[PDB]
Structure 1
Amino acid sequence: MKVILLEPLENLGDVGQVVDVKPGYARNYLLPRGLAVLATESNLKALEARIRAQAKRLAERKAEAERLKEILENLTLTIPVRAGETKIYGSVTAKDIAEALSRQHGVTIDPKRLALEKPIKELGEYVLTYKPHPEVPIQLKVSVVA
């Protein structure tokens, strides 16, 4: 009796996988507890209808990140600050790097998705890490100047 696991279950399989069990275990245990559904044909394509979306919806998340890694790795956000010789009087935060992008290049960016643990207090060229979607990270070149 093939059925569709809706929950990972001890030594049966992973949710969405279709495995074989004795009928009694199915219609008297797994089914009334929501733990699975019978692997009919009606709710068989229904399962293929979900693996289809998730495949394409997760690839669109990878495709939209690339429609910004191309941009951000081909530019330089230049930040004019007030500083003496090396060290800044204020500082430049992810919030600043965010609004400064929207100012020049107009790209909207999530500052919490930018690899900055300490605000920046010293002039120079920086290349930081931007991770919008994991496994698709961006290296942003950002020039701070007086």
Structure 2
Amino acid sequence: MKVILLEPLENLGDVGQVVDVKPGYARNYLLPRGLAVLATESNLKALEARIRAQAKRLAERKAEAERLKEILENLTLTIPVRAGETKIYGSVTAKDIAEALSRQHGVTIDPKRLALEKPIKELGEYVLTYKPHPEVPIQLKVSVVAQ
């Protein structure tokens, strides 16, 4: 008897997979405990239309992030600070870069996503990955400068 697993069960199959088991197993264990649903043709489309819709929201992330990988990687965030020789008196944070990428260049950005543990305490030209979506990591060139 074909069923659609609602959960991944050991040596049975992965959630949402169509497996074949014995009638009594499905009727007196799986279906009563919510572990699987009858692989009827009706909800076999319900499975299909989730496989379909979930792939749609995901490829929309990988093609909205791509447009955000075009704006960045094709510009530079110049950041003016007060600096002595090379060490900065303050510090430039990811929050600073975000609030900097706001007013300048127009793009608002999520600070918590940027890859930067400690605040930048020296001048220079940095390459900071953004990661708005895995496998789509945006390399941002940010130039810390003085005055």
Give the deviation of 1:10 after TM superposition. Answer: 1.2
User: 1: distance between equivalents of 2:93 and 2:46?
Assistant: 47
Identity fraction in percent: 100
Structure 1: 4+ residue segments shifted above 6 A: none
Structure 1 residue 135: Cα displacement: 1.0
Shift of 1:111: 0.7
**Runs (5+) with no aligned partner, structure 1:** none
Q: Per the alignment, in what secondary structure is the counterpart of residue 131 of structure 1?
A: coil
Output the TM-score relative to the length of structure 2: 0.97
> Corresponding residue for 1:131?
131
Distance in 2, matches of 1:63 and 1:126, equals: 26
What does the per-residue CA deviation read over 1:84-139, in whole Å, with 9 as the maximum and x for residues that have no partner?
11110001000100011011111111111001111011111111111011111011
RMSD between aligned residues: 0.6
Following TM superposition, by how much is the alpha carbon of 1:12 offset from its aligned partner in structure 2, in angstroms? 0.9
Structure 2, unaligned stretches of length 5 or more?
none
SS of aligned partner of 1:137: coil
2:131 match: secondary structure:
strand
C-alpha distance in 2 between matches for 1:34 and 1:137: 39
Alpha-carbon distance between aligned partners in 1 of 2:56 and 2:10, rounded to the nearest angstrom? 30
Report Cα offsets for 1:61-94 as digits up to 9, x if no partner.
1111101011110001100001111110001000
1:11 Cα offset (Å): 1.0
* Superimposed CA distance per residue, residues 38-74 of structure 1 (whole angstroms, 9 cap, x where no aligned partner): 1001111111110000111110011111010111100
> Corresponding residue for 2:120?
120
Equivalent position SS for 1:141: strand
